[PDB]
Amino acid sequence: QVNIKKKEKWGIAHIYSSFNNTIIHITDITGAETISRWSGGMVVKADRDEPSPYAAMLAARRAAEEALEKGIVGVHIRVRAPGGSKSKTPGPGAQAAIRALARAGLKIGRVEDVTPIPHDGTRPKGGRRGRRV
User: Would you say 69 and 59 are in contact if contact means Cβ atoms under 8 Å apart?
Assistant: no
> Which listed residue (16, 72, 93, 100) binds RNA by CB under 7 A?
16
Host H or E run for residue 11: strand 10-17
How far is C-alpha 64 from the geometric centre of its chain's CA atoms? Answer: 12
CB-nearer residue toward RNA: 111 or 122: 122
CA distance 9 to 23: 22
Site for RNA in 34-73 (CB under 7 A): 34, 37, 39-42, 45-48, 50-51
User: Closer to RNA at the Cβ: 25 or 61?
Assistant: 25
* Pairing status of strand 10-17 against strand 74-80: parallel
Question: Which segment (1-9, 15-23, 68-76, 96-104) binds RNA by CB under 7 A?
Answer: 15-23
Q: Which residues contact 3 (CB under 8 A, 6 or more apart)?
A: none
Per-residue interface string for the shown chain with RNA, residues 104-133, x marking contact by CB under 7 A: ----------x-xxxxx-x--x-----xxx
Angle, CA 12 vertex, CA 18 and CA 1 arms, to 5°: 130
Residues that bind RNA (CB under 7 A): 14, 16, 18-21, 23, 25, 27, 30-34, 37, 39-42, 45-48, 50-51, 80, 82-84, 86, 114, 116-120, 122, 125, 131-133
